């Protein structure tokens, strides 16, 4: 799994075209959605996770959960990032990390999955505003 | 080398902490900049591209400028994110990134090195606009 982590003033999006034939189905209102003083996580679920999705997805949370923690956000979104793990697999592993942050006390977002999304985001420049992690099974 | 190509409606930036001790010596006019529809170029200069510079960049110029060229983007931003090569190389890498899309024919913008900065960005949400390439010396 790659993750990027960008702690924003704000991040807002709207739904574009699908990107799989049959997408997540969404209502009118889940097609736009904006978050404020937010750190923003973009995953990308690779096919070694695969191997283990629920240690991947528990490393993830507790990655995410950290750097939020060191930057006080209590805002988090959970964006899908498009070698990658089939849809299902990434499915799995998003929503596990999302449900898991959210059993963290964060106030959690997500995208829906399987579309193209275009998105506005203001990156905050502070030294932990732009940070990276690999995660991969043990 | 890992690059990730954001197809933008607006990039628009502001320097703000050094993040290192000696970073690229900047004007007053060149702490903020802007540039609209441009395909917005994140490289990170990896320690495996030390091995072969020259290469990296040339595979780098080129992967950039066929993106920019399928979008139809005029307008390219060259910005450096933070295993990583030492500041001279990567310095050097994104110069030559930086001169050899300008000698394409690309307008070309560029961020002052050594420093955190923070940026607003506009992400288009088509097909392509949000890319990522890994290079690496053969």
Redesign the interface.
């Known amino acids: 799994m790659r993750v990027l982590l960008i702690h924003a003033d704000y991040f807002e999006y709207?739904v574009?075209?699908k990107?799989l034939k049959n997408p997540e189905p969404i209502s009118e209102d889940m097609k736009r959605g904006r978050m404020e003083e937010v750190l923003v996580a973009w995953i990308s679920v690779e096919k070694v996770d695969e191997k283990n999705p629920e240690e991947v997805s528990l490393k993830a949370i507790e990655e995410i959960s950290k750097v939020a923690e060191q930057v006080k956000a209590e805002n988090v979104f959970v964006a899908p990032?498009?070698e990658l793990a089939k849809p299902s697999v990434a499915m799995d592993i998003l929503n596990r990390v999302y449900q898991g942050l959210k059993e963290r006390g964060f106030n959690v977002g997500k995208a829906p999955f399987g579309y193209?999304?275009?998105?506005?985001?203001?990156?905050?420049?502070?030294?932990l505003?732009?940070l990276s992690r690999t995660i991969v099974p043990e």
Chains 1, 2 share one sequence.
């Open positions: 709207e574009k075209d990107a990032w498009a193209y999304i275009a998105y506005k985001i203001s990156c905050k420049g502070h030294p505003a732009e």
